[PDB]
Design a protein around this nucleic acid. Structure first.
Ligand SMILES: [Mg+2]
Ligand SMILES: [Mg+2]
Ligand SMILES: [Mg+2]
Ligand SMILES: [Mg+2]
Ligand SMILES: [Mg+2]
Ligand SMILES: [Mg+2]
Ligand SMILES: [Mg+2]
Ligand SMILES: [Mg+2]
Ligand SMILES: [Mg+2]
Ligand SMILES: [Mg+2]
Ligand SMILES: [Mg+2]
Ligand SMILES: [Mg+2]
Ligand SMILES: [Mg+2]
Ligand SMILES: [Mg+2]
Ligand SMILES: [Mg+2]
Ligand SMILES: [Mg+2]
Ligand SMILES: [Mg+2]
Ligand SMILES: [Mg+2]
Ligand SMILES: [Mg+2]
Ligand SMILES: [Mg+2]
Ligand SMILES: [Mg+2]
Ligand SMILES: [Mg+2]
Ligand SMILES: [Mg+2]
Ligand SMILES: [Mg+2]
Ligand SMILES: [Mg+2]
Ligand SMILES: [Mg+2]
Ligand SMILES: [Mg+2]
Ligand SMILES: [Mg+2]
Ligand SMILES: [Mg+2]
Ligand SMILES: [Mg+2]
Ligand SMILES: [Mg+2]
Ligand SMILES: [Mg+2]
Ligand SMILES: [Mg+2]
Ligand SMILES: [Mg+2]
Ligand SMILES: [Mg+2]
Ligand SMILES: [Mg+2]
Ligand SMILES: [Mg+2]
Ligand SMILES: [Mg+2]
Ligand SMILES: [Mg+2]
Ligand SMILES: [Mg+2]
Ligand SMILES: [Mg+2]
Ligand SMILES: [Mg+2]
Ligand SMILES: [Mg+2]
Ligand SMILES: [Mg+2]
Ligand SMILES: [Mg+2]
Ligand SMILES: [Mg+2]
Ligand SMILES: [Mg+2]
Ligand SMILES: [Mg+2]
Ligand SMILES: [Mg+2]
Ligand SMILES: [Mg+2]
Ligand SMILES: [Mg+2]
Ligand SMILES: [Mg+2]
Ligand SMILES: [Mg+2]
Ligand SMILES: [Mg+2]
Ligand SMILES: [Mg+2]
Ligand SMILES: [Mg+2]
Ligand SMILES: [Mg+2]
Ligand SMILES: [Mg+2]
Ligand SMILES: [Mg+2]
Ligand SMILES: [Mg+2]
Ligand SMILES: [Mg+2]
Ligand SMILES: [Mg+2]
Ligand SMILES: [Mg+2]
Ligand SMILES: [Mg+2]
Ligand SMILES: [Mg+2]
Ligand SMILES: [Mg+2]
Ligand SMILES: [Mg+2]
Ligand SMILES: [Mg+2]
Ligand SMILES: [Mg+2]
Ligand SMILES: [Mg+2]
Ligand SMILES: [Mg+2]
Ligand SMILES: [Mg+2]
Ligand SMILES: [Mg+2]
Ligand SMILES: [Mg+2]
Ligand SMILES: [Mg+2]
Ligand SMILES: [Mg+2]
Ligand SMILES: [Mg+2]
Ligand SMILES: [Mg+2]
Ligand SMILES: [Mg+2]
Ligand SMILES: [Mg+2]
Ligand SMILES: [Mg+2]
Ligand SMILES: [Mg+2]
Ligand SMILES: [Mg+2]
Ligand SMILES: [Mg+2]
Ligand SMILES: [Mg+2]
Ligand SMILES: [Mg+2]
Ligand SMILES: [Mg+2]
Ligand SMILES: [Mg+2]
Ligand SMILES: [Mg+2]
Lengths: 141, 38, 174, 57, 208
RNA sequence: GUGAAGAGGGAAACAACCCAGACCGCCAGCUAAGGUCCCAAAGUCAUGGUUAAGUGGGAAACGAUGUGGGAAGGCCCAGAC
RNA sequence: CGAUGUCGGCUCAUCACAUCCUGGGGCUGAAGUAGGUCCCAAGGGUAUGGCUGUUCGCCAUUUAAAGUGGUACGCGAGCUG
RNA sequence: UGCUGAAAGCAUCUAAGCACGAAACUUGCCCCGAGAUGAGUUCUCCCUGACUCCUUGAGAGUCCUGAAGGAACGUUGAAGA
């Protein structure tokens, strides 16, 4: 008899903080992507962005098992004649520590307008300070 | 050194060592016997 | 296993301190610090030191036997102080110290002024011989290895910087 | 869609979907996904009682 | 740091021994500081300067005010220079050509003379195909631009015809000959970009 | 046997491989192969081990005090390796 | 097969590394000079002529070098024939 | 290539740990570069009147004002199809 669907205007979105110090990259990234999508919520609708705003702070301190600190490579093409760039997990944190969580989450989000809309929700930070004190973002684990 | 796929103890003073995943054969007497891989 | 099961003696005037895993050994020659591995567990038992493998960790004995052999050298270092005898073989090869900078002349177009990191006391009894002293085997051995690496033994005349105890294989011309 | 909703609403009360449904089957509860999903959204105070009912088994 | 100056053609200086050195005459008027940027507000340390003298009806109010905050007269155009930690300047200060009295070599940046739509022969030094021997409507044309099925596409940065010049280009480590304080000149050896009248950013050579 | 002349689920995509034969409808439930951290429905399930190579996630002769199990065989208190 | 223009040259290239030069190393029957072989390394560089449709090849003279290959044996809605 | 150093009384460049080490890699040099929709930053400038309608909207108007600035037009250029 027409089952419930979450109406964007009625969606009450919440703010959270996650300290990523000593967390496993992927196991963090998953639990982030689960929240950003809004799966945890009982009013989950696949075509609407029901998920919560998350602030990941201390992104540079994120942990990785085995030899992935040196061995894990992040390839990308420049769209140029032969321009394949690569960067290891160390090299990536040395330059752009935000990109590490970003890339890990973006792979686990869906691919499309809504998938990009539910990435905007995520707020990564290298340092411990965040300037979103105005939202009263509660602590998450 | 040699980089053959079947390194082995040629003389008596030759010694097998595993450095950084690769099996090497280091020798005191003849540096000729110095050989890596395999 | 066998090295680890053999306590290190600690002579008098050698202040040992265990800050969790971070060990500090102070003595007459110099103060030495060692951030030890997590898998090793170390304690004071009577006069001597004891090194035990931790339960749960895979490689305990290998890690502990290292700690043993390190602290054994660390205690001997602060008590006695280690030395290395380097000699310069070949004509026109000169070694002269000025402060904490060893001036090597080894047949180059520029004299090589090697720096000495940490507490390393460099001396020269003769002009073609370098005797250097200190606390750490690590830093000494390294410095010695650098001073060697500027001009290793040529296996023909034996020319270059050599360790005193080191034998060198020379060969004939063909 | 329903299964996701039920799996979401169950984990708020501390049980996964897989264990919840076995819990309901073992208590001979005949209520379907369509309604469990309807209850999950609308009446959570009611829904909680099904998760307790499942917890018994 | 650097100074802005109009290009004023070319000459030569004859040295008394014999050598004639071809020099570019860069007039470098009083470069006056309109603004000083710092780490608190801007996140980097720099100075904005001006030079020349723009007529008052041609300068707009948003810039007329911008000059009135400093107190300087409205110069034609604004340029910014990054400070090298040690040095520090004040708003309303006039930097003169006497900064280059100490230096030997300078990087000169300018806008190259616009050649318009240039073909591949002129733009990229492509070789002209045979001028006769059967050649049909394809003397100065670029020839092939790719392979076949495999890419099935032209690659990015493929050298083709297009806009040549009117681009900002930098000539490095040019030897400063004379630094005339009285007429406000700066004679550099060689040739620098842009035509007579074009604006040049002259600054000390980074490649020492 | 299947396709040809067979849709549906799985094997990323994949006529012939694995599961299974669509009369029509339903916003019902149980299962097959195959699956259950996220893309994406369901175990960050339970217990006991192995693996450190990102093996898993292409390959041989041959090479090696890698590392686990075992079943044996050479020596002690006259104290061997 | 209701047409996917086939060698060679020119123009324009681009990638691989099984490296010709240049860079870093081990062994050497490595005195030095110069090599020999092997290892890592693909940033950049890598002839002009004579003969022949030639690719190749031989020859003359250079060069630090005159690399081997893929790209519809790259490139004819770009030229040649 | 080493240093210290186990596992393996020793030995061994490594299993803890620690140094060197190439035109490669990341910067350094030059250029583009906030459509970088994650659309950034600094400085300056300008506009500070009312009535009507409403299904009370970030709503449609009536009137008085038209700024900063821009475009258009002209004379044009070492800028340019
Ligand atoms: Mg190595
Ligand atoms: Mg490997
Ligand atoms: Mg022009
Ligand atoms: Mg022309
Ligand atoms: Mg030219
Ligand atoms: Mg030509
Ligand atoms: Mg021609
Ligand atoms: Mg013709
Ligand atoms: Mg034609
Ligand atoms: Mg014709
Ligand atoms: Mg013609
Ligand atoms: Mg044509
Ligand atoms: Mg035509
Ligand atoms: Mg110069
Ligand atoms: Mg048929
Ligand atoms: Mg089928
Ligand atoms: Mg199928
Ligand atoms: Mg397959
Ligand atoms: Mg799949
Ligand atoms: Mg699939
Ligand atoms: Mg499928
Ligand atoms: Mg097939
Ligand atoms: Mg089966
Ligand atoms: Mg049937
Ligand atoms: Mg049927
Ligand atoms: Mg039926
Ligand atoms: Mg079922
Ligand atoms: Mg059942
Ligand atoms: Mg499975
Ligand atoms: Mg999909
Ligand atoms: Mg799927
Ligand atoms: Mg799921
Ligand atoms: Mg588990
Ligand atoms: Mg693999
Ligand atoms: Mg074997
Ligand atoms: Mg037995
Ligand atoms: Mg046909
Ligand atoms: Mg056709
Ligand atoms: Mg043809
Ligand atoms: Mg042929
Ligand atoms: Mg030709
Ligand atoms: Mg070309
Ligand atoms: Mg190679
Ligand atoms: Mg070979
Ligand atoms: Mg090679
Ligand atoms: Mg070679
Ligand atoms: Mg050279
Ligand atoms: Mg050199
Ligand atoms: Mg060498
Ligand atoms: Mg390789
Ligand atoms: Mg090349
Ligand atoms: Mg490359
Ligand atoms: Mg290249
Ligand atoms: Mg480089
Ligand atoms: Mg070039
Ligand atoms: Mg002739
Ligand atoms: Mg010819
Ligand atoms: Mg010849
Ligand atoms: Mg030559
Ligand atoms: Mg070739
Ligand atoms: Mg091929
Ligand atoms: Mg072929
Ligand atoms: Mg080919
Ligand atoms: Mg062809
Ligand atoms: Mg070709
Ligand atoms: Mg074509
Ligand atoms: Mg062709
Ligand atoms: Mg034609
Ligand atoms: Mg013909
Ligand atoms: Mg003809
Ligand atoms: Mg030892
Ligand atoms: Mg030794
Ligand atoms: Mg280094
Ligand atoms: Mg060079
Ligand atoms: Mg710009
Ligand atoms: Mg914004
Ligand atoms: Mg702004
Ligand atoms: Mg501002
Ligand atoms: Mg008002
Ligand atoms: Mg209005
Ligand atoms: Mg009016
Ligand atoms: Mg108007
Ligand atoms: Mg008006
Ligand atoms: Mg106006
Ligand atoms: Mg304008
Ligand atoms: Mg117009
Ligand atoms: Mg006009
Ligand atoms: Mg005109
Ligand atoms: Mg005109």
């Amino acid at each position: 008899m027409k089952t419930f669907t979450a109406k964007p205007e009625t969606v009450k979105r919440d703010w959270y903080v996650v300290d990523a110090t000593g967390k496993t990259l992927g196991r963090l990234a998953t639990e982030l992507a689960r929240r950003l999508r809004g799966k945890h919520k009982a009013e989950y609708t696949p075509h609407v962005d029901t998920g919560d705003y998350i602030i990941v702070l201390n992104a540079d301190k994120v942990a990785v098992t085995g030899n992935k600190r040196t061995d894990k490579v992040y390839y990308h093409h420049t769209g140029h004649i032969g321009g394949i760039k690569q960067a290891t997990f160390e090299e990536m944190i040395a330059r752009r520590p935000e990109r590490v969580i970003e890339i890990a989450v973006k792979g686990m989000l869906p691919k499309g307008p809504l998938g990009r809309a539910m990435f905007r929700k995520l707020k990564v930070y290298a340092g411990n300070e965040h300037n979103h004190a105005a939202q009263q973002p509660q602590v998450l684990d | 050194m040699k980089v053959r796929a079947s390194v082995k103890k040629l003389c008596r003073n030759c010694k097998i060592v595993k450095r950084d995943g690769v099996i090497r054969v280091i020798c005191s007497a003849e540096p000729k016997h110095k050989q890596r891989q395999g | 296993s066998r090295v680890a099961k053999a306590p290190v003696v600690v002579p008098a005037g050698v202040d040992v301190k265990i800050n969790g895993q971070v060990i500090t050994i102070k003595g007459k020659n110099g103060e030495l610090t060692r951030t030890l591995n997590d898998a090793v567990e170390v304690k004071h038992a009577d006069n001597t030191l004891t090194f035990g493998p931790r339960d749960g960790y895979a490689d305990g004995w290998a890690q502990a036997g290292t700690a043993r052999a390190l602290l054994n050298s660390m205690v001997i270092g602060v008590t006695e102080g280690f030395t290395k005898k380097l000699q310069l073989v070949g004509v026109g090869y000169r070694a002269a110290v000025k402060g904490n900078v060893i001036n090597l002349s080894l047949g180059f177009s520029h004299p090589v002024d090697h720096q000495l990191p940490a507490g390393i006391t460099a001396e020269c009894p003769t002009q073609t011989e370098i005797v250097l002293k200190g606390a750490d085997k690590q830093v000494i051995g390294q410095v010695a290895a650098d001073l060697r690496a500027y001009r290793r033994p040529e296996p023909y005349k034996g020319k270059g910087v050599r360790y005193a105890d080191e034998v060198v294989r020379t060969k004939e011309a063909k | 869609l329903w299964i996701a909703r039920i799996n979401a609403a169950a984990r708020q009360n501390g049980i996964s979907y897989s264990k919840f449904i076995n819990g309901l089957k073992k208590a001979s509860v005949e209520i379907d996904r369509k309604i469990l999903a309807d209850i999950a959204v609308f009446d959570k105070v009611a829904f909680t009682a099904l998760v307790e009912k499942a917890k018994a088994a | 740091i650097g100074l802005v100056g109009k290009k004023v053609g070319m000459t030569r200086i004859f040295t008394e021994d014999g050598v004639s050195i071809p020099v570019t005459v860069i007039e470098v008027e009083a470069n006056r500081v309109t603004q000083v940027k710092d780490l608190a507000n801007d996140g980097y340390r720099a100075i904005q300067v001006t030079t020349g003298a723009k007529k008052a009806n041609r300068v707009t109010k948003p810039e007329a005010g911008h000059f009135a905050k400093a107190g300087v007269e409205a110069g034609r155009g604004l340029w910014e220079f990054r400070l090298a930690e040690g040095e520090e300047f004040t708003v309303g200060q006039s930097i003169s050509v006497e900064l280059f009295a100490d230096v030997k070599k300078v990087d000169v940046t300018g806008t190259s003379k616009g050649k318009g739509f240039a073909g591949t022969v002129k733009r990229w030094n492509f070789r002209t195909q045979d001028a006769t021997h059967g050649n049909s409507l394809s003397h100065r044309v670029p020839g092939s631009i790719g392979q076949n099925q495999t890419p099935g596409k032209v690659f990015k940065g493929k050298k083709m015809a297009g806009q040549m010049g009117n681009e900002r280009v930098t000539v490095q480590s040019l030897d400063v000959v004379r630094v005339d304080a009285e007429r406000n000149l700066l004679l550099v050896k060689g040739a620098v970009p842009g035509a007579t009248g074009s604006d040049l950013i002259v600054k000390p050579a980074v490649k020492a």
